[PDB]
Design a protein around this nucleic acid. Structure first.
Ligand code: MG
Ligand code: MG
Ligand code: MG
Ligand code: MG
Ligand code: MG
Ligand code: MG
Ligand code: MG
Ligand code: MG
Ligand code: MG
Ligand code: MG
Ligand code: MG
Ligand code: MG
Ligand code: MG
Ligand code: MG
Ligand code: MG
Ligand code: MG
Ligand code: MG
Ligand code: ZN
Lengths: 83, 116, 66, 177
RNA sequence: UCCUCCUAAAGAGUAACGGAGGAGCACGAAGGUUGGCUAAUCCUGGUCGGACAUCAGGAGGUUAGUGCAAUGGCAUAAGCC
RNA sequence: ACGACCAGGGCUACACACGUGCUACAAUGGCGCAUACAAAGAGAAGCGACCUCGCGAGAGCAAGCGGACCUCAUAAAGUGCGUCGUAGUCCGGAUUGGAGUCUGCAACUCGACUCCAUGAAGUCGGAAUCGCUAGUAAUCGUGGAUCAGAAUGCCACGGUG
């Protein structure tokens, strides 16, 4: 994982969208290609439609989803089975 | 010979019979015996019961069998409930850490499943 | 009770690591040294501590500062 | 009879107070404790049964009554009359002394003990629990083992309801939860 | 050939290539006596243990049982130790 | 547009089958302590001492070096003592949880490494089949290219033999 001395990582355009949706207090789905951005505690309660390569899957944000990244909740490979 | 709930073989040495504890290994067993002032080459044999009470207190400093297994299952069910990629791997039975599934996933997948 | 068929059931002394002393009737014969009793079992404090859920936001804010 | 004396002096006064019973005979009391080991694997050999009765005879100083099949079932490959288990009924002082050694010694000797259930009182006060492993009793020597068994304990009391037995065992500081 | 029920018409009996089932034994205890006991099934709870082993309580009240077919009996048990 | 730009994804999927390899199933060994002997190479957006902190990967300050001068860099197997005493073991290390470091805008998919814990299969491998004639096989470590980082591969090197 990343070093603690660099802190976390988040896209700036995401952090601005978070600051806006925080102040407006709107839970409209934010479509986002930043699968590599760590979720912040100010993101709680937001629908963020993370890209997966093909579309934007909406993610409601929970308390426990903080110390993770947005890409963990958008699986890129669909697999059902062989038979 | 009964530490933290479980029994401990008497014939073996100290670090090994401690490593029978789910939550300690040879490192933490050395830290226990170092905190008790007990030599590592002695057995669970010829120990004073005061020495064993000190040992129980040092193991009780850490997290062990029932606590540790409960915490591990809680962490896994946290991933299960989130529905992350590690949760999906944990409940598909597939390897989590980014290993290969084309070949050699036999630890998580068990033995071979013949196409019948 | 019958006379011979049942095992010997004799009062012995059981002392513990918490210094409890309790005389019970048992089939052991010899004296007994215990490890935990109901007095010294961590059922009323330790098992209460042993839940230990922990916070995810608190780990996050703990690991650094903005 | 230490717990029987503790019953007679403090539990009765407690329950008469916390229930407002008209009579002291209206109070609950424990009646018997039944110790079953259902041994379905003794159909292979009697010595497994013969050793389970020896172990349970050390726990409670009684020779156990070897129980048999009431009827025949084919899913378990038994016929009516096969010795299939062993039980011990404990009454009186031997009941109280076992109940003392139980709640004082053996329940603490349970691996990962974290309490009992209060949802095992069969609607009519009689409590039933089951232990996984006989080594929690100190009567058993650990090397002197043959096979890890398990048994079940059934405390039969005179409580009509379920809560009157729950209050009775709580009066004996019985580790529910 | 023998047994049980119906046909058989409220005593007995009563036929047909009429309707349905069995027997050609078993037991030295599965007999005698004294003493004692009382089922089936289901519900809840409970270690392995599961629809179903064993254990504890409750409902129920013979719906069970009777060495074997059926019928009639059987709690004073003829049933079970 | 079959041309061009960008983000994200993918080339790493997984009921399975094969090839080539690595580590093993231990006692001619595992562990712990002490200790001896190499060659050949690379180095400036680089190699990076010493000293300090950290269990540790590493971090800080920071010399020296375009290098028979300095660094990578203590060779390991070995030997000596003690230890385990034949067990799925003090073998084996997979897997997984937690805590971290570094690189790099950025390690979720999808990096390497460290620490604690975890401790699968495996007790020498069916039919079948491969390599090798002497410093060879076997075994033991070392270095380099590619490369920000990322080898059990590749190309080279010496040790025992
Ligand atoms: Mg251990
Ligand atoms: Mg007539
Ligand atoms: Mg007539
Ligand atoms: Mg008869
Ligand atoms: Mg009679
Ligand atoms: Mg049941
Ligand atoms: Mg691109
Ligand atoms: Mg490829
Ligand atoms: Mg240091
Ligand atoms: Mg050596
Ligand atoms: Mg050694
Ligand atoms: Mg090991
Ligand atoms: Mg390890
Ligand atoms: Mg095996
Ligand atoms: Mg072996
Ligand atoms: Mg290089
Ligand atoms: Mg590299
Ligand atoms: Zn105690």
């Amino acid at each position: 994982p990343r070093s603690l001395k660099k802190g976390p990582f988040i896209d700036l355009h995401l952090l601005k969208k978070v600051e806006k949706a925080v102040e407006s207090g709107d839970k409209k789905p934010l479509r986002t290609w930043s699968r590599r951005s760590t979720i912040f505690p100010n993101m709680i309660g937001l629908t963020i439609a993370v890209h997966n390569g093909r579309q934007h899957v909406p993610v409601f944000v929970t308390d426990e989803m903080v110390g993770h990244k947005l890409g963990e909740f958008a699986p890129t490979r669909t697999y059902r089975g062989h038979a | 010979a009964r530490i933290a709930g479980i029994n401990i073989p008497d014939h073996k040495h100290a670090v090994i019979a401690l490593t029978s504890i789910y939550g300690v290994g040879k490192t933490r067993s050395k830290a226990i015996l170092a905190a008790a002032g007990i030599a590592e080459d002695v057995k669970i044999s010829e120990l004073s019961e005061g020495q064993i009470d000190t040992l129980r207190d040092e193991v009780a400093k850490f997290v062990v069998e029932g606590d540790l297994r409960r915490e591990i299952s809680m962490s896994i069910k946290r991933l299960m409930d989130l529905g992350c990629y590690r949760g999906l791997r944990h409940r598909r039975g597939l390897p989590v850490r980014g290993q290969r599934t084309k070949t050699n996933a036999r630890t998580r997948k068990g033995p071979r499943k013949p196409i019948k | 009770m019958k006379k011979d068929i049942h095992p010997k059931y004799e009062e012995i002394t059981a002392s513990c690591s918490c210094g409890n002393v309790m005389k019970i009737r048992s089939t052991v014969g010899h004296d007994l040294n215990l490890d935990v009793c109901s007095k010294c079992h961590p059922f009323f404090t330790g098992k209460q501590r042993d839940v230990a859920t922990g916070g995810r936001v608190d780990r996050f804010n703990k690991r650094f500062n903005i | 009879a230490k717990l029987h004396d503790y019953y007679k002096d403090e539990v009765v006064k407690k329950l008469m107070t916390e229930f407002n019973y008209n009579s002291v005979m209206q109070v609950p009391r424990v009646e018997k404790i039944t110790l079953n080991m259902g041994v379905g694997e003794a159909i292979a050999d009697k010595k497994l049964l013969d050793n389970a009765a020896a172990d349970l005879a050390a726990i409670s100083g009684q020779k156990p009554l070897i129980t048999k099949a009431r009827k025949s079932v084919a899913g378990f490959k038994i016929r009516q009359g096969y010795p299939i288990g062993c039980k011990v009924t404990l009454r009186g002082e031997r009941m109280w002394e076992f109940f003392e050694r139980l709640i004082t010694i053996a329940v603490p000797r349970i691996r990962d003990f974290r309490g009992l259930s209060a949802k095992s009182f069969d609607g009519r006060g009689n409590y039933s629990m089951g232990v996984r492993e006989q080594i929690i009793f100190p009567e058993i020597d650990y090397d002197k083992v043959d096979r890890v068994r398990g048994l079940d304990i059934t405390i039969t009391t005179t409580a009509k309801s379920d809560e009157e037995g729950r209050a009775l065992l709580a009066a004996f500081d019985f580790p529910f939860r």
